[PDB]
Amino acid sequence: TRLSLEAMLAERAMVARQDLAGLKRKLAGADRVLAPQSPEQCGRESAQAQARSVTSELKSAVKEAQGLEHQTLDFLEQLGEYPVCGILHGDHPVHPSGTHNNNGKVSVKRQFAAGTSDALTCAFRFEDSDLVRETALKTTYTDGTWAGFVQRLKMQTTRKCVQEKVSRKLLKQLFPYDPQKLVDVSGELSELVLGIKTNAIASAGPPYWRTKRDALPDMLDCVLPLLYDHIVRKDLTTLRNKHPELFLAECKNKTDRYEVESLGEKTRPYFSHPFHLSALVSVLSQSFSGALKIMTEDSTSFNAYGFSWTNGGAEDLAIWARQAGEAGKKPPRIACYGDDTDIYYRKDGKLYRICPDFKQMDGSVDATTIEAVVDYVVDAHVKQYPTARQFWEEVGKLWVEMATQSPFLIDGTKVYRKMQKDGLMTGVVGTTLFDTVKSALAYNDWADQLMFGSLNLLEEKYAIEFFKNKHGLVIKEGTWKPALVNEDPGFGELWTEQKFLGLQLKVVRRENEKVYVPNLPFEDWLTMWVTPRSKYRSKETETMRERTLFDRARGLLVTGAVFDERARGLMGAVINSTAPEVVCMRVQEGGGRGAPPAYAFLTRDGVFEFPISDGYPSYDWVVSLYSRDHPCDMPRVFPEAATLIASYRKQVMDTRVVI
Amino acid sequence: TRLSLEAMLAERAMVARQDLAGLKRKLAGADRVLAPQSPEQCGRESAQAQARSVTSELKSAVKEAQGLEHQTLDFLEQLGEYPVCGILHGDHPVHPSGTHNNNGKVSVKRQFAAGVNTSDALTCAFRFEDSDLVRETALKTTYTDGTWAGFVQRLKMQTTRKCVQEKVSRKLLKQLFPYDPQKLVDVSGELSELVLGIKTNAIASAGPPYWRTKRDALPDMLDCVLPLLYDHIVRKDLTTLRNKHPELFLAECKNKTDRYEVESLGEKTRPYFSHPFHLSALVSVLSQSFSGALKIMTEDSTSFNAYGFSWTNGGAEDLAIWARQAGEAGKKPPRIACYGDDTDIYYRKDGKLYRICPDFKQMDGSVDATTIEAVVDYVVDAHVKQYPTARQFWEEVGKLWVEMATQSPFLIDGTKVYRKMQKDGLMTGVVGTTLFDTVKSALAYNDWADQLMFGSLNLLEEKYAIEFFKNKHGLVIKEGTWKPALVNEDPGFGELWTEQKFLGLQLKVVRRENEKVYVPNLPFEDWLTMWVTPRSKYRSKETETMRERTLFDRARGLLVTGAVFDERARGLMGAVINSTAPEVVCMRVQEGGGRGAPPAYAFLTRDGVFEFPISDGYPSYDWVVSLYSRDHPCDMPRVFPEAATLIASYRKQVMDTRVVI
Ligand SMILES: [Mg+2]
Ligand SMILES: [Mg+2]
């Protein structure tokens, strides 16, 4: 008696899905269920050479833009230099020795490196050569450029803003929430802070200069109680003046997909705040976003922050939109998510959709909006939990400061500050909500003006002037183009050609029912496919790179690529060309279910889980994800994999037989 | 990727306990709770040299004994050679290519290696204990493969003894071995699910034709051989299978690596038989179900069965309560408990309680075929009476069980296949060995007890008892081991019931709060023998960390088994625990499901599974006594009370959000 044979089998299975050579051998000749795929266009040698040619040209384009000189930073206030923080936690300084330290002053260095071929090689292997080359040459995943970084930083720290007229009553109307879903912030702080969610590998900011996971004990055990003590004694000025690095941010260039042709003019900045400040404010921010209604749940709400497409969401959007009324008679339907908007109105009874773009919206976010949002979120909590009002009002003051006036490093030891409170410091906790409110306030006023009779605000020329003069918002010319909505699309038809949250809305068939699903043209799926958000990693083994392609193919199929013939066929070719042992190996990501899709708005929580790491997204299964309460199993690539790997298939052996 | 800080901390803690360098640093100034310990007696240098001298002398004794010539194997029937099994499972033969194959015939090679156990534990004993005693104790016993000479000598002894057929019926077995029929497994279920329920040792040999560990051979056994076996059972066609694939019924006769007395290495090495996995797993359905249903003597006063007795949670005291019911010899029934070849006998003479603990000499040679067949029939009948729709299948399995216990062909060394000349004599290692031994012993002691009631009170005396067990039951009682002892029926704190052992342990009373607690006990010298003779040989790639952690785990196991109740044994184990490095105490460990390897002693609990509460606690007197107490639960003390927060580098501080500012 050590263990049951059943337990023995279970343990053998765990080890077996870790033996790639063993999986290869045991899956040999197994029945494989193949996804639909496009036919091969060229051989491995040609596909790889064609991908290398594109990559070489892009590397050259990046190197040239990265060589451009950049403007001076004179548009910011200069604050001198900060001393490296000396606070100790036990045996070590919280600011690690010999890092981010130039002769005792805090220092940083911006990364603009000039360093994706695997996915591009696949696209050339299975898709049209000219189309793949032309698409892949337009966009690249890059650190960007000094010149474009400074240009964009200037644009969002020097804009003339308009202070919004906003009150708690108005925000209740535009952003209703469920008070019973707010976290009880009159509880103990440690336990509240331990509840916030964040990215384990994101930077903890100054003074930690480490990942959040590495810095977490220093933040929790050492800095947070120090911060708390000075908050409640109203003594933050002493802490700031003695330990300025505790309130210092870092201004960083965002590595991202960028258009090759504007690399020299556009790289997006964002700000990385100290871990203790962002974690503390996240208690309010994440509690509030968790409690917000979205527009499909409450027709007075302008909020789409929280909207998600699966489980009927896509159709919820359309049902909500069809309620839009005749302009100048009845309310339009306006949904705001960060700087993204979906606008519906009727003219002569016909439904129209507008999907305009703001230019560098964060530069237009005025300080009055920022303070009103903080006050609205704080007041929501203290109305429900009034015994903790004063503590969280102090936190709200920290939040406003972080969003508007934190000092920050860029490159070297020079500390900077924005000249004015106006302009949102992108990346601060709550960025998305600040953007959403500013947009909704502007569109709410727009809708009021329609009811006042100014129906020419339906027209681009006057709309652009209105948003600029009355709200300090820049609507990109050419983006205000009302489109006739196909209100009840037929099978395979689009709602409109416009995108919201990065996706089109389409109707497809399941049985004989219409299902609303996300969609994109092939070229847009291809752009995402060929520009993975990962740099050359020598660590990445052939097996890991092979598995990455499989996971990314699954992710795009679930996001809607299964509903485009070519995109579906490309992802299917990737899946079909994945080795059996790579399909069936044990994987870490997704809790062993396989890495979830990159697209953030499939579900409200943001966490999507594949049912199994060795399934693939068939049309039927993905459609079932977008249908309401209509479930389908994810199909296995190798139906017999479990028993093949275990080298055992149960046979019923009856003990009751006559002998 | 996106996680709560709470989950982030939990994940950090997991990583932290795998980083020995980090643990060492974070536990450096940690406040340590010390177990009671003996003081250091000599330095490391002197302790290692003294240990080296002992191992060197033992290695020499073993090599010489292993050189002794062995007697011939002519006392067995010889059956020729068997062909290597050719059955394929998918892409491979069930009998691995290029192993156990001599020109197409099945072959084995007995291992009699000259490597003893390790010297780490012996070094600790020299470090913290008296030099003469450690040396004298260590020279007496060694963990060894044994010798050819002793192996064959012992094999002959248990395959050639004249046995006495027992007079036994289902009615008598019901009387001596009551069981709960509702606890029997429903063997009219589907066979696969029944076989997947049996428990065995993942790394034991799967036997012929697999020649692999049970873990490695399991899919071959389950998916390939078992259904083949099943098909031939239900078609009454086993003869076809045996004649075509004889390796499917072949056993291996093996020398048991074990602790052995150095001075008898040449005369005594234990044989046992390793049967094919498919046979032992199939029969284990009945055997393990039956032992799960058996009553033990402390639950039913008619039962002679202690197979299933366990010491913790009041068991030790249950034994004493049960024993005190023994009556005046020749007037009222004694109290007799049988476990394998071990017995505990109680009777009263002039009202005074006496205890006998005799030893059988190689009892398996004495187990007669009538007893074996009766035990199988009783176990089968119990199941088919409770589950009558499966009578015929399990009656066929019972026939296989009897063959495996009495007549399986077997290899020893080379290709020669042998068989025991007679049915009599139990093939030690067959599934059910313990029960077969237990029934044979109980049948004999039941007859002994009957003779007392008939007036034969001279059977209380060794001379007449030994003659009776030989002549009436073919059992050999070892001279000098029938020595009735006055029992201390109500021992005071620190006092023994008797100095005798049962299941390897003495019975003692100790104090907990203000109550008496009955606990297992041993003299220091016996704990020391076990401590210095680990059941493990030298293994390369066994890092110092693993070796240090093994000493820690073995010290815990001995303390829990009863060493905490002997002052010197407690002090030696405590010295080892206290000298274990903090990072070794607090590191993450695999054994015991992350709680630390459980004690080697098998009878702490009935199911056999013992789990430590935490891998970084130590067994204090208070905690161990609580395990033997009837309910009284106690927490296992941590060696480093602050380890968790030190390792996490975080200790919660209450920060009130309701403050006025
Ligand atoms: Mg848009
Ligand atoms: Mg005994």
Residue numbers in the entry:
A (entry chain A): 11 to 125, 128 to 671
B (entry chain B): 11 to 671
Lines from the paper:
Thosea asigna virus (TaV) is a (+) ssRNA virus that infects the larvae of a defoliating moth (Setothosea asigna) and the prototypic member of the Permutotetraviridae family. In a previous work we have structurally and functionally characterized the non-canonical RdRP domain of TaV (TaVpol: residues 1-674 of the ORF1 product), showing close resemblances with flaviviral RdRPs. Here we report the X-ray structures of TaVpol captured in three replication-elongation states, revealing high resolution mechanistic details of different events in the nucleotide addition cycle for a non-canonical RdRP.
The X-ray analysis of the Δ10-TaVpol construct, crystallized in the presence of large amounts of Mg2+ (19% PEG 3350, 0.18 M MgSO4), revealed the existence of a second metal ion-binding site located nearby the catalytic cavity, in a non-catalytic position. The resulting electron density maps at 2.07 Å resolution showed strong peaks of extra density in the two molecules of the asymmetric unit. The solvent molecules participating in Mg2+ coordination appear also to interact with the polymerase side chains of residues of D369: w1, w2 and w3; T353: w4, with the main chain N and carboxyl oxygens of residues T353 (N), P368 (O)M w4, with the main chain oxygen of K51: w3 and with the main chain oxygen of C3676: w5. The presence of non-catalytic Mg2+ ions at the polymerases central cavity were previously described in other RdRPs and recently, the role of these ions in the nucleotide addition cycle has been reviewed by Gong and collaborators.
